[PDB]
From Swiss-Prot, chains A, B:
<protein>
    <recommendedName>
        <fullName>RNA polymerase sigma factor SigA</fullName>
    </recommendedName>
</protein>
<dbReference type="GO" id="GO:0003677">
    <property type="term" value="F:DNA binding"/>
</dbReference>
<feature type="region of interest" description="Sigma-70 factor domain-3">
    <location>
        <begin position="189"/>
        <end position="240"/>
    </location>
</feature>
<dbReference type="GO" id="GO:0005737">
    <property type="term" value="C:cytoplasm"/>
</dbReference>
<feature type="region of interest" description="Sigma-70 factor domain-1">
    <location>
        <begin position="1"/>
        <end position="36"/>
    </location>
</feature>
<comment type="function">
    <text>Sigma factors are initiation factors that promote the attachment of RNA polymerase to specific initiation sites and are then released. This sigma factor is the primary sigma factor during exponential growth.</text>
</comment>
<keyword id="KW-0963">Cytoplasm</keyword>
<comment type="similarity">
    <text>Belongs to the sigma-70 factor family. RpoD/SigA subfamily.</text>
</comment>
<keyword id="KW-0731">Sigma factor</keyword>
<keyword id="KW-0804">Transcription</keyword>
<comment type="subunit">
    <text>Interacts transiently with the RNA polymerase catalytic core formed by RpoA, RpoB, RpoC and RpoZ (2 alpha, 1 beta, 1 beta' and 1 omega subunit) to form the RNA polymerase holoenzyme that can initiate transcription.</text>
</comment>
<dbReference type="GO" id="GO:0016987">
    <property type="term" value="F:sigma factor activity"/>
</dbReference>
<feature type="region of interest" description="Sigma-70 factor domain-2">
    <location>
        <begin position="110"/>
        <end position="180"/>
    </location>
</feature>
<keyword id="KW-0805">Transcription regulation</keyword>
<feature type="short sequence motif" description="Interaction with polymerase core subunit RpoC">
    <location>
        <begin position="134"/>
        <end position="137"/>
    </location>
</feature>
<dbReference type="GO" id="GO:0006352">
    <property type="term" value="P:DNA-templated transcription initiation"/>
</dbReference>
<keyword id="KW-0238">DNA-binding</keyword>
Amino acid sequence: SDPVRQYLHEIGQVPLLTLEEEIDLARKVEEGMEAIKKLSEATGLDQELIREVVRAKILGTARIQKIPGLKEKPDPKTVEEVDGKLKSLPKELKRYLHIAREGEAARQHLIEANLRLVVSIAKKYTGRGLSFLDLIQEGNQGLIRAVEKFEYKRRFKFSTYATWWIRQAINRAIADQARTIRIPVHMVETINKLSRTARQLQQELGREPSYEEIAEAMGPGWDAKRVEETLKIAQEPVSL
Amino acid sequence: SDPVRQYLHEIGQVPLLTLEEEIDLARKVEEGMEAIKKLSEATGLDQELIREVVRAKILGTARIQKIPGLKEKPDPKTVEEVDGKLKSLPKELKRYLHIAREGEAARQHLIEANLRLVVSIAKKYTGRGLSFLDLIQEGNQGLIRAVEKFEYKRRFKFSTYATWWIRQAINRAIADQARTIRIPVHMVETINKLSRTARQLQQELGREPSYEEIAEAMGPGWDAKRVEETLKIAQEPVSL
């Protein structure tokens, strides 16, 4: 509920990308990073800073400016100086700053075309420690990290790749809030069995099995609902 | 059939790993890369050669000796030639030679424990330009690439991470043998509608949709079979 429905409403507006668009944006991000290097390496302003500022300047026109989980303004003190130097730059270094602003706007477009992916994934990690809103924030951070790890030259879909990162971030967050208590052996046994079964089904399907498929290998006695619930106290909580 | 049948038989007898196990083998692999980097500082030889030789040493004791598609052993000569250079080092450095041998054997265990996943993925890419053997070969080259990019510190499932790299290697292989044809626009339009549909469902599912699901989105007039056959001429041929 709350603005969460607002968020979902707003992002539901961003269009989807084609492998071609995903990859062109990706390439612009790398070229952008590449440029920022030149800037820092001629201004001594340190790469991370230059980017935070360039990024901020783009959040201005950003179709979605307040994305949960992501740190915003690079601190009104540093931005209010680091942007001072970038402004007054010889003609030559003026283009490197252009490729930077253009690559960071690209990075924003990519992140935006996948905010729905993050929400969808987060709905799959519901009721396991964090609130829907909290999950979305962790997930979005994973998305950002994926954009930083993606390799456009491989020319293979970004969403699937990002999915792993979006999930690893969420998986890490819910695994943080835990205490070690006592559980009866038979429970420890079936958790370990749900885990092996799911991993085994994966080696056969070339993808993670569904709760209904895990229940097949387990059943009778086990159905989709039961496996998912029991899997809530597992080291590997979710399947796909 | 043929040696593929023997291959499938061998890998069928390699036990599946657990998240805890993958991550541990992964940590040893990285610590091994670390040792190697230092053996390269000392000995003066190239890092990759040292790994190949070290790796060669292990394939002799490894469960699955010959994996289709992976580089060949350096050769008896260049092997027992790099070992002489190695062994002949102070007591200090010799410590590393053991860390590298440990991680490299670890790497083989991580690989071995996932050959079934490759074959499975490869089955989902048949009849699109390459033989079963050929698909398996590229797939493994991708699995190898996954081990080289995987981050054990993230402590999240290696299998599903590698799936992407295995698939990208295969996807590339088939997308490499292709010519340009003139195709009617209604086809170029549906091929795109197909692709957008797939990608939309993904943003909603948190995973790639099944052909059955893509058929639901298109249809009537569309069934799982038809979206798959048609998707064969697409730039994004397969789903999951």
